[PDB]
Design a protein around this ligand. Structure first.
Ligand SMILES: Nc1ncnc2c1ncn2[C@@H]1O[C@H](COP(=O)(O)OP(=O)(O)O)[C@@H](O)[C@H]1O
Ligand SMILES: [Mg+2]
Length: 378
């Protein structure tokens, strides 16, 4: 079986495979090229991926996500302490290590973060196998550039327990560069800027590549900024609209909100190609059908400050790396949020018209690069 490339992401994961000089990003059962990093436990089963995320509104306490934020970390970790204040599931201490606690088939069960991730990993593995029509064993898994050795270890472990022989763990930005071929030797130093705006995390990385060797000269971003924050803004906006229109506040009804959010995220994706999208929700609150729409202009207006602030981490990355806009040779877009027009304009304007690398789907770039790296490693 060919070695595969796996992007084990915070909110979305992707698997690609190099074959006949071409990289193929493998779609899942539902036909999507990326699958949510969600795991849900019920009375009768364990749901992973889309099936899992498609019921989080119904089974909040038993639907686990954000496992990547826990992996390789300690319970006493300030990150963990701050984080768990927002997850609808339990995180318990176990001799220092944190564990997620769920109820599976009536009985209480706990899992180490690496076990949750191995579940997502097994899902990607069978997606690959379903496509290849053969067993996948070897793999290259990606990790953020800021991951310490514990976090890398845990990611490796998640692989082993998922039945995957992890050939190598490579940084996500480096995987993005390899996807565009920016790793080929041109007898000169090259500075690449990776602008990664995903589902819930934002990362900016400046790589220096000479002789084919990478050198992460600097990094920046925000671990709590992503496409989900843009969704929230739409939600708050629509909650206020429903109120004016029906003098009812649906805030308390978690289900109404969760369904509205799902409609928003979808409208958001449509907004990246169309100037407006309709929000059609049957029986949102009580028996009131919420039928409305948003325009790209209003969308951009709701997230203006968020979008604009995206440039601060870019300026920081520059000054830390000791470079000026003029010195960065290539800029590659990574993450599903970079498909947003305003974000592309804004970044280009900042780099005074410089062309942006974006021919490869941004949310598939890391997988793409890992698959290539897997191919050379085997
Ligand atoms: N067309 C699009 N326009 C805007 N956002 C998009 C689009 N397609 C996907 N996204 C967003 O990308 C995010 C997922 O990004 P992705 O990079 O796949 O995840 P991760 O951050 O987990 O690595 C979600 O917030 C999703 O709404
Ligand atoms: Mg990502």
């Amino acid at each position: 079986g060919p070695a595969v490339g796996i992007d084990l992401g915070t909110t979305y994961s992707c698997v690609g495979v190099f074959q006949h000089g071409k990289v193929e990003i493998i779609a899942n059962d539902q036909g999507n090229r990326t699958t949510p990093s969600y795991v849900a436990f019920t009375d009768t089963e364990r749901l992973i991926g889309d099936a899992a995320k498609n019921q989080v509104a119904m089974n909040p306490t038993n639907t686990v996500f954000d496992a990547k934020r826990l992996i390789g970390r300690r319970f006493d970790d300030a990150v963990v302490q701050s984080d768990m204040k927002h997850w609808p599931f339990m995180v318990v201490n176990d001799a220092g290590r944190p564990k997620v606690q769920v109820e599976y088939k009536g009985e209480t069960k706990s899992f180490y973060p690496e076990e949750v991730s191995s579940m997502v990993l097994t899902k990607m593995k069978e997606i690959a196998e379903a496509y290849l029509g053969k067993t996948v064993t070897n793999a290259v898994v990606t990790v953020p550039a800021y991951f310490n050795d514990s976090q890398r270890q845990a990611t490796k472990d998640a692989g082993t327990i998922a039945g995957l022989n992890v050939l190598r763990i490579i940084n996500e930005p480096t995987a993005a560069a390899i996807a565009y071929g920016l790793d080929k030797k041109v007898g000169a130093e090259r500075n690449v800027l990776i602008f990664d705006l995903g589902g819930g995390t934002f990362n900016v990385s400046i790589l220096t590549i000479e002789d084919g060797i990478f050198e992460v000269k600097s990094t920046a971003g925000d671990t709590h900024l992503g496409g989900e924050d843009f969704d929230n803004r739409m939600v708050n906006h629509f909650i206020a609209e429903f109120k004016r229109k029906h003098k009812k506040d649906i805030s308390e009804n978690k289900r109404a909100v969760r369904r509205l959010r799902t409609a928003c995220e979808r409208a958001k994706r449509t907004l990246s190609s169309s100037t407006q999208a309709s929000i059609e929700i049957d029986s949102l609150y009580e028996g009131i059908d919420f039928y409305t729409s948003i325009t790209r202009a209003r969308f951009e207006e709701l997230n203006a400050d968020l979008f604009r602030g995206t440039l601060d981490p870019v300026e920081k990355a520059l000054r830390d790396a000791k470079l000026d806009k003029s010195q960065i040779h290539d800029i590659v877009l990574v993450g599903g949020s970079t498909r947003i027009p305003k974000i592309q304009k804004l970044l280009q304007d900042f780099f005074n018209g410089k062309e942006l690398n974006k021919s490869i789907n941004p949310d598939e770039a890391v997988a793409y690069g890992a698959a290539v790296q897997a191919a050379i490693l085997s």
